[PDB]
Amino acid sequence: VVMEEIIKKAFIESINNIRRGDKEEELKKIQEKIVNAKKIVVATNNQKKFKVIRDIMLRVCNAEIKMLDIDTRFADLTRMPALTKGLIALDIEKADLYIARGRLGAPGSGSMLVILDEKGRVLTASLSPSSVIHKEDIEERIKKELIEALSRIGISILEH
Amino acid sequence: VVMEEIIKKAFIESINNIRRGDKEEELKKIQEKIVNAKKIVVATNNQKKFKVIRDIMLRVCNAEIKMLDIDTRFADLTRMPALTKGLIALDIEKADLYIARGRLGAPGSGSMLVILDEKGRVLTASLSPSSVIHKEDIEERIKKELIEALSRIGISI
Amino acid sequence: VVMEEIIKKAFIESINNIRRGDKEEELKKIQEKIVNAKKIVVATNNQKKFKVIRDIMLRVCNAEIKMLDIDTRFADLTRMPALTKGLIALDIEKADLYIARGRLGAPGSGSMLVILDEKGRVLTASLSPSSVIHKEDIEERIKKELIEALSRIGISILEH
Amino acid sequence: VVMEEIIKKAFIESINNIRRGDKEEELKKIQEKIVNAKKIVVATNNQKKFKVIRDIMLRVCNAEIKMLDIDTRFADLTRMPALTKGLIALDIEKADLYIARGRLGAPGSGSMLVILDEKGRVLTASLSPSSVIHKEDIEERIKKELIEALSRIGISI
Ligand SMILES: Cc1cc(OP(=O)(O)OC[C@H]2O[C@@H](n3cnc4c(=O)[nH]c(N)nc43)[C@H](O)[C@@H]2O)c(C)c(=O)[nH]1
Ligand SMILES: Cc1cc(OP(=O)(O)OC[C@H]2O[C@@H](n3cnc4c(=O)[nH]c(N)nc43)[C@H](O)[C@@H]2O)c(C)c(=O)[nH]1
Ligand SMILES: Cc1cc(OP(=O)(O)OC[C@H]2O[C@@H](n3cnc4c(=O)[nH]c(N)nc43)[C@H](O)[C@@H]2O)c(C)c(=O)[nH]1
Ligand SMILES: Cc1cc(OP(=O)(O)OC[C@H]2O[C@@H](n3cnc4c(=O)[nH]c(N)nc43)[C@H](O)[C@@H]2O)c(C)c(=O)[nH]1
Ligand SMILES: Nc1nc2c(ncn2[C@@H]2O[C@H](COP(=O)(O)OP(=O)(O)O)[C@@H](O)[C@H]2O)c(=O)[nH]1
Ligand SMILES: [Mg+2]
Ligand SMILES: [Mg+2]
């Protein structure tokens, strides 16, 4: 069943006041979109943030993965920089998923990593404190944010 | 030093390719906005949700804390329901801080708890998976979400 | 050539600070999207708005055109209700274009008619005052809105 | 009565499915916020957009009026740049009214002039076609946009 249909049903539940959380069928659909993706676009500058994310994604899918270099001055004055980044990618490349990483909200708010589908829907995301608290190397943070973003919707990065 | 000024300095750092992450002064300003709020709106009309959140906030600040008048479940038809719940609150009550908890994104995407300031800025947030994964009490979950949203910007219970 | 590439060119003009207005290639692409649509969804439950819109759109394209079948009234709790409606249609139906009409922003701000494509981009739009001021039948207002929305991006609705 | 309270009444009409169009009381409130503004910010660092808009607003109010120190061109890669510009002004400046002018949506979609209040709500707005269609100077178009935005909410010169 198409994604549009599963979503119309969750919306009807809410109108009729009987919506009692996320459903199994919904999680399954999000899993499918991710593992069967054919094209993925990652929004970063920097050839080594790209490498951490590409090596993790090749473990869950058989997709072509392309970097896209976003002049970030055009995202970091918006209300929600990471989310802005993914949508910039959405407008200028055809793909099945878009992954981006940046400031969550107002300055001092820390990090967000987010995954969008081909219509801009937020499928999953992950968060980190300001580096002034967690004090980890940016590469190591990206790894953890990705692994948790995949696992909270049911995709394990371990051997099957 | 007022919030407008701190954000201007951060914005001009980004214009000049000098921004190297969140600064000390930015964390301290957020911390202050939260511990010094005189009025907090919880963007909900479910009494269970309201109660866990009111009781926790009462340990970090000294504010009047009220729930909303109308059902925020109608936010569940937008792209980012939790976010929408905050902005609904902001439209219909004056307050220094708005707290809202709902679905993150599309159906299946789990939870988001977010804290907004009086102009709708996003100060901090935390996320959980769908409950069919974590299998916890909703009151337990809200409790862990709020504690993490505070500790990540440097407030400890 | 594809919409992603045309938008990329425009984004690279802004980055390089030589973006001195919309380009003819941009207008042509938007016209083409509208003229060649096969499926259109009108994000309304009002049979009177639907009819003005369907009778006008049939003059410029040869598409299947339908309305939305869940309640749209809850859009009126959000910041930009006409927009929200278009995005609710996007999320629950497959189509090449979405057309919505509602309140512009805050209570008292009048009406917006808006047109989105399959990825949620805003292609064109038009406004009316509150009817406390303009005082006209709704059908007449819908008609004028749609006509201006189409012609400001270069689609003539007249004889020929 | 305050804006929050007028907005809550309208939201309750929608929930009970009795809302129609705009109310008289709502128009008067918006009129009153604009005519009595003490501080207006024009969301731009371009002097030419600033003068046209400053000159028109002085025909309807007695506000102090300012522009910004930073360029708002950095909004032009978002989905709705004119909106984004207004929100960038709201984040770095306290005012009663914010006025912004930019692209409506996607490239080729024309222009939008938009007015926000102190919490970011959209009060009124005006659109033009791309200039390759209308062919007029930018100072003339901005002048037309602003005059229509005020008259559509009932403020005339
Ligand atoms: C993950 C998710 C949250 C959500 O919004 P909420 O207002 O937080 O939750 C609506 C209902 O969904 C169920 N639920 C949400 N979170 C939880 C949870 O963490 N543990 C349990 N047991 N149940 C939950 C409860 O019945 C809630 O009352 C909605 C509407 C959704 O579709 N998915
Ligand atoms: C939290 C935050 C993130 C952010 O955007 P990003 O693209 O993720 O980071 C831009 C720079 O900000 C710093 N930074 C962000 N997160 C981290 C991190 O987790 N560890 C380290 N060492 N540094 C980081 C790095 O120097 C990056 O090169 C920006 C732009 C911001 O203001 N705050
Ligand atoms: C319609 C449109 C507007 C727009 O942003 P703006 O800040 O309003 O204008 C950017 C440049 O686009 C040109 N422009 C915009 N509106 C006009 C106009 O009404 N008349 C003329 N002659 N030119 C205009 C000017 O060169 C502006 O400096 C952008 C960035 C865009 O891509 N399209
Ligand atoms: C200006 C405005 C519009 C609006 O939403 P809409 O879907 O555009 O219109 C809602 C109802 O308000 C009335 N109405 C709206 N626009 C018009 C109009 O232009 N002429 C007339 N006669 N009536 C109108 C009709 O009863 C509509 O069905 C809402 C919900 C609002 O609060 N304000
Ligand atoms: N009797 C009556 N019903 C109305 C009027 N305006 C709207 N309605 C009802 O409300 C429905 C929704 O219309 P509207 O909210 O404009 O549609 P939307 O564009 O889907 O939001 C209509 O189809 C009518 O049944 C009116 O003036 N009189
Ligand atoms: Mg309606
Ligand atoms: Mg003919």
Domain identity same for C22 and C54 = no
Structure tokens at D137: 């100077």
Measured CA to CA in angstroms, residue C116 lies from A116, B6, C96, C124 at distances of 18, 36, 9, 8
- Phi and psi at D34, nearest 5°, equal -80, -55
Total domain count, chain A: 2
**End-to-end Cα, chain D, rounded Å:** 26
d(CA B136, CA B138): 6
Query: What's the DSSP call for residue B80?
Result: S
Residue A71, Cβ neighbours under 10 Å: how many? 16
The residues near B9 (Cβ < 8 Å, ≥ 6 apart) are none
**A86 at interface of D, judged by CB pairs closer than 8 A:** no
d(CA C118, CA C139): 27
| Ligand 5 atom at minimal distance to the Cα of residue C47 | 23
Whose Cα sits closest to atom 4 in ligand 2?
A103
Domain identity same for C99 and C159 = yes
Among A22, A30, A122, A123, name the best residue to mutate to test ligand 1's pocket (greatest count of ligand atoms within 8 A of Cβ): A22
Measured CA to CA in angstroms, residue C16 lies from A71, A89, C6 at distances of 10, 18, 16
Q: Which of B91, B97, B98, B116 to mutate to test the interface with D (most CBs of D within 10 A)?
A: B91
Domain identity same for D8 and D77 = no
CATH number at residue D20: 1.10.287.470
d(CA A48, CA A61): 20
Domain identity same for D1 and D69 = no
Select from D74, D79, D106 the Cβ nearest to the Cβ of A77: D74
Whose Cα sits closest to atom 13 in ligand 3?
C21
d(CA B33, CA B52): 21
Domain identity same for C65 and C47 = yes
Q: Is C11 helix (H, G, I), strand (E, B) or coil?
A: helix
d(CA D25, CA C45): 27
- Cα atoms in the Cβ-side hemisphere of radius 13 Å centred on A111: 24
Amino acid identity of residue C78, one-letter, is: T
CATH number at residue C52: 3.40.50.10150
Q: How far is A74 from chain D (nearest CA, A)?
A: 5
- Phi and psi at A112, nearest 5°, equal -130, 140
Select from D69, D93, D119 the Cβ nearest to the Cβ of B90: D119
The distance between the two most distant Cα atoms of chain C, rounded to a whole number of Å, is: 48
Q: How far is D57 from chain A (nearest CA, A)?
A: 27
All residues of chain D having their beta carbon less than 8 Å from the beta carbon of residue A74 are: 74, 76-77
Range of the domain at B20: 1-36
d(CA D156, CA A86): 42
Query: What's the DSSP call for residue B70?
Result: S
Domain identity same for B67 and B133 = yes
| Ligand 5 atom at minimal distance to the Cα of residue C68 | 20
Contact criterion met (CB below 8 Å) for D112 and D102: yes
Domain identity same for A41 and A98 = yes
Stated in angstroms to one decimal place, the resolution of this structure is 2.4
d(CA C158, CA C150): 11
Number of A/D CB contacts below 8 angstroms equals: 24
- Cα atoms in the Cβ-side hemisphere of radius 13 Å centred on B33: 28
Select from A74, A79, A88 the Cβ nearest to the Cβ of D74: A74
Ligand 2: centre distance to CA D69 (Å): 25
User: What are the start-end ranges of the H helices in B16-137?
Assistant: 24-35, 47-57, 81-92, 131-134
Number of B/C CB contacts below 8 angstroms equals: 20
Per-residue DSSP letters for chain D? --HHHHHHHHHHHHHTT---S--HHHHHHHHHHHHT-SEEEES---HHHHHHHHHHHTTT---EEE--SS-GGGGTTSSSHHHHHHHHHHHH---SEEEEEEE-SSTTS-EEEEEEETT--EEEEEEE--HHHH---HHHHHHHHHHHHHHTTT---
Nearest bound ligand to the CA of residue C159: 7
All residues of chain D having their beta carbon less than 8 Å from the beta carbon of residue B118 are: 119
Domain identity same for C62 and C5 = no
- For chain A, the chains sharing at least 3 beta-carbon pairs closer than 8 angstroms are B, C, D
Structure tokens at D82: 């004119």
Domain identity same for B61 and B100 = yes
Domain identity same for A47 and A29 = no
Domain identity same for B45 and B32 = no
Contact criterion met (CB below 8 Å) for D108 and D92: no
The residues near B76 (Cβ < 8 Å, ≥ 6 apart) are A10, A11, A14, A19, B102, B103
Residues 20-39 of A with CB under 8 A from B: 21-24, 26-27, 29-30
Among C41, C46, C68, C139, name the best residue to mutate to test ligand 5's pocket (greatest count of ligand atoms within 8 A of Cβ): C46
Query: What's the DSSP call for residue B67?
Result: E
Domain identity same for D14 and D78 = no
d(CA A139, CA A156): 20
The residues near D34 (Cβ < 8 Å, ≥ 6 apart) are D60, D61, D97, D115, D123, D150, D153, D155
Among D103, D128, D140, D146, name the best residue to mutate to test ligand 3's pocket (greatest count of ligand atoms within 8 A of Cβ): D103
d(CA C145, CA C140): 9
Give the pairing type, strands D64-66 and D97-103. Answer: unpaired
d(CA A29, CA B113): 24
Structure tokens at B47: 């009494």
The residues near C136 (Cβ < 8 Å, ≥ 6 apart) are none
Pocket residues for ligand 4 (CB within 6 Å)?
C 46, 76, 101-103, 107, 110-111, 128, 130-131, 136-138, 141; D 19-22
Is the sign of the CA dihedral C140, C144, C149, C153 positive or negative?
positive
Q: Is C71 helix (H, G, I), strand (E, B) or coil?
A: coil
All residues of chain C having their beta carbon less than 8 Å from the beta carbon of residue B88 are: 77-78
Whose Cα sits closest to atom 20 in ligand 2?
A138
